[PDB]
Amino acid sequence: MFYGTVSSPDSGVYEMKIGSIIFQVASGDITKEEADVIVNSTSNSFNLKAGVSKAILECAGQNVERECSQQAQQRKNDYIITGGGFLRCKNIIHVIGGNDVKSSVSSVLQECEKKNYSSICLPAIGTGNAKQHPDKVAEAIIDAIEDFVQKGSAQSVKKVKVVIFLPQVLDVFYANMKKREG
Ligand X SMILES: Cc1cc(C)nc(Nc2ccc(N)cc2)n1
Residue list for the binding site for a glycoprotein:
29-30, 41, 52, 126-130, 165
- What are the b/e assignments for 159-171, b being 16+ CB within 10 Å? bbbbbbbeeebbe
In whole angstroms, give the CA distance from residue 142 to residue 3: 11
Binding site for ligand X (CB under 6 A): 29-31, 51-52, 54-55, 58, 128, 165
CB nearer to Cl ion: pick between 128 and 154: 128
Please report whether residue 92 would count as binding Cl ion according to CB under 5 A.
no
- DSSP-derived secondary structure letter, 154: -
In whole angstroms, give the CA distance from residue 129 to residue 145: 24
Contact letters for Cl ion, residues 123-152 (x by CB under 5 A): xx-x-xxx----------------------
**Residue 30 interacts with, from ligand X, Cl ion, none (CB under 5-8 Å by kind):** ligand X
Give the DSSP H/E element, type plus range, for residue 39. strand 37-42
Please report whether residue 41 would count as binding Cl ion according to CB under 5 A.
yes
CB nearer to ligand X: pick between 31 and 99: 31
**Selection from 111, 110, 121, 116 nearest residue 159 by Cα:** 121
**Residue 84 interacts with, from ligand X, Cl ion, none (CB under 5-8 Å by kind):** none
